Amino acid sequence: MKPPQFTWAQWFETQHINMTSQQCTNAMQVINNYQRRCKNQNTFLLTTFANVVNVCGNPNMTCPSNKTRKNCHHSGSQVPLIHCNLTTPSPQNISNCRYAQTPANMFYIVACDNRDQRRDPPQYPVVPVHLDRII
Ligand SMILES: Nc1ccn(Cc2cn([C@H]3[C@@H](O)[C@H](n4cnc5c(N)ncnc54)O[C@@H]3CO)nn2)c(=O)n1
User: Fold this and answer.
1) DSSP class per residue in 31-81
2) Domain containing 59 — which CATH number?
3) Nearest residue CA, atom 23 of ligand 1?
4) Which of 3, 39, 86, 105 lies 20 to 30 Å from 32 when distance is taken between CA atoms?
5) What is the phi/psi pair of residue 39, to 5°?
6) In this chain, where does the modification 3'-nitrotyrosine occur?
7) Closest ligand 1 atom number to CA of residue 1
8) How far apart are CA 124 and CA 51, in angstroms?
9) Structural domain total, the chain
């Protein structure tokens, strides 16, 4: 999925933090144009990248999606978020994909890892790399 110019942290930011429009159909064009497919579901967290990095500092927990991974972290508090769901596919013209939008206030669990040594900025040695669950 992930284009080669992005670190996993930059991809996380692109998929889940930088909602470029408050409208799902428009915001999703960015993700979809990058991955060359209309993503079926996607959550944007209405929080800051710095706040998610802080969540990486919360206690480690098992990742809901993988019982073998212990690099997950619970947000502690709820945040506002928007879930985008594909309503109108368009695999031969990605730009014509349309989405529904669902606002909610929920907890989240992220997986974090050490930053990309060559490409992530040194400011944040530990970065979110995957949104594992919304609760
Ligand atoms: N260019 C490429 C190269 C490979 N892939 C496959 C791929 C897809 N993923 C996603 C999850 O499998 C992976 N992931 C899930 N759980 C965890 C976890 N506990 N800790 C670190 N990461 C996790 O994070 C990625 C973000 O959703 N990772 N690799 C790709 O899509 N594009």
Assistant:
1) HHHHHTS--SEEEEESS-HHHHHHHHTSPEE-BTTBTT---EEE-SS-EEE
2) 3.10.130.10
3) 130
4) 105
5) -65, 135
6) 34
7) 31
8) 12
9) 1
Query: Which tokens is 35 given?
Result: 């991955």
Residue with CA nearest ligand 1 atom 7 = 1
Q: Is the CB of 9 under 6 A from ligand 1?
A: no
- Which residue range is the domain that position 79 belongs to? 1-135
37 and 43 in contact (C-beta within 8 Å)? no
Helix or strand run (H / E) with residue 26: helix 24-35
Q: Over the range 41-73, which residues count as b (16 or more CB within 10 Å of their CB) and which as e?
A: ebbbbebebeebbebbeeeeeebeeeeeeebbb
- The closest alpha carbon to 105, from 123, 130, 83, belongs to 83
Evaluate: CB of 111 within 6 angstroms of ligand 1.
Answer: yes
Kindly give, in sequence order, each residue whose CB lies less than 8 Å from that of residue 68, ignoring residues fewer than 6 positions away: none
Give the resolution in Å: 1.3
Technique used by the depositors? X-ray
